[PDB]
């Protein structure tokens, strides 16, 4: 009753660094179908994202020359990214160990799953793939403030691992980099990669009365559970990317220790002290 999963199937015949888990992007492995799936996904997202995605995201797609019609060549994209913020993307097989992921970010390397979902999975894939990782995550790396936030997040991995607090950082990442909203004078916009690559979450997170929208608060977020297989019950809202970066500056160690003893908020809870939008 067990068959190899998509990550295993896609990486047949390929290898990865046993410590940093990178490989050269295997350009030869992309089929015509892959390029067509990419183009379909790209087109679908670009139709639905105007007035929903933050303006910086859509600008980043353009400035980085993210291919509309084929899976991007990572090396070519890196020429633009490096000149902008000194970041680059690196190819990985799929999910990688946490300390490796943090080490990458700490060194301004963004790990991107190299392979793409199959066409029958157009609507949704549970695993990260190159569409979610590249299209969703990479365009904001052109923004120097957002890029510094990621670098600072990466550097915080060492302290968090030493204190048994990686899950608390994982929650911060989830509720910002993956599922964050940013308020603007024009209305609420989206910066989270998991929403930006989604067929439908883009609609729900802005239009539905169902989810909570709560002002960003570092300690609250680090004490908040999430689930991976459903639309978010709570979205955290920032005023600016500067708020994220500034949140990483003070000593996180006493926050971890105070939370180690604590009971976390459920994914759909509102805390007594929340600023509820
Ligand atoms: Co392996
Ligand atoms: Co992601």
Ligand in nearest proximity to the CA of 174:
2
Measured in angstroms, how far is the CA atom of residue 109 from the centroid of ligand 1?
20
Q: Are 216 and 238 in contact (CB under 8 A)?
A: yes
Per-residue DSSP letter, 262:
S
CATH number at residue 59: 1.10.800.10
- The secondary element (H helix, E strand) that includes residue 276 is none
Q: How many Å apart are CA 84 and CA 141, to the nearest integer?
A: 9
Residues making up the annotated binding site for Fe cation are 132, 137, 178
- The secondary element (H helix, E strand) that includes residue 19 is none
Residues 38, 42, 45, 48: is their CA dihedral positive or negative?
negative
Find the angle CA(241)-CA(244)-CA(248) to the nearest 5 degrees: 145
Q: How many Å apart are CA 275 and CA 267, to the nearest integer?
A: 16
Task: Identify any residues that bridge with 88 across adjacent strands, giving them in sequence order.
Answer: 109
Task: State how many domains the chain has.
Answer: 1
Ligand in nearest proximity to the CA of 16:
1
Measured in angstroms, how far is the CA atom of residue 16 from the centroid of ligand 1?
6
| Residues written for the chain | 277
Per-residue DSSP letter, 89:
E
- The secondary element (H helix, E strand) that includes residue 50 is none
- Cα 221 from chain centroid? 16
Q: Resolution, in Å, please?
A: 1.5
Ligand in nearest proximity to the CA of 132:
2
Q: Which residues contact 4 (CB under 8 A, 6 or more apart)?
A: none
Q: Rounded to whole angstroms, what are the CA distances from 113 to 21, 25, 132, 134, 141? A: 11, 9, 9, 8, 16
Residues 97, 224, 245, 77: is their CA dihedral positive or negative?
positive
Q: How many Å apart are CA 156 and CA 137, to the nearest integer?
A: 19
Measured in angstroms, how far is the CA atom of residue 158 from the centroid of ligand 1?
23
Range of the domain at 3: 1-277
């Amino acid at each position: 009753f067990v068959v190899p999963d998509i990550t295993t199937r896609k990486n047949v015949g390929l290898s990865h660094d046993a410590n940093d888990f990178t490989l050269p992007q295997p350009l030869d492995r992309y089929s015509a179908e892959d390029h067509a799936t990419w183009a379909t996904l790209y087109q679908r997202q670009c139709k639905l994202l105007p007035g929903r995605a933050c303006d910086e995201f859509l600008e980043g797609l353009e400035r980085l020359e993210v291919d509309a019609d084929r899976v991007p060549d990572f090396n070519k994209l890196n020429e633009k990214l490096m000149a902008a913020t000194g970041w680059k993307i690196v190819a990985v097989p799929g999910l990688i160990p946490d300390d490796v992921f943090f080490e990458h970010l700490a060194n301004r390397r963004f790990p991107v799953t190299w392979w793409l979902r199959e066409p029958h999975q157009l609507d949704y894939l549970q695993e990260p793939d190159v569409f979610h990782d590249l299209f969703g995550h990479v365009p904001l790396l052109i923004n120097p403030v957002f890029a510094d936030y990621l670098e600072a997040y990466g550097k915080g991995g060492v302290k968090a691992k030493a204190l048994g607090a990686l899950p608390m950082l994982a929650r911060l990442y989830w509720y910002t980099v993956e599922f964050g909203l940013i308020n603007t004078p024009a209305g609420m916009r989206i910066y989270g990669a998991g929403i930006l690559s989604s067929k439908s979450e883009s609609i729900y997170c802005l239009d539905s009365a169902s989810p909570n929208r709560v002002g960003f608060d570092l300690m609250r977020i680090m004490n908040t559970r999430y689930r991976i297989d459903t639309f978010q019950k709570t979205y955290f809202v920032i005023d600016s990317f500067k708020q994220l970066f500034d949140a990483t500056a003070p000593d996180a160690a006493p926050l971890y220790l105070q939370l180690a003893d604590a009971q976390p908020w459920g994914a759909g809870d509102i805390a007594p002290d929340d600023l509820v939008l």
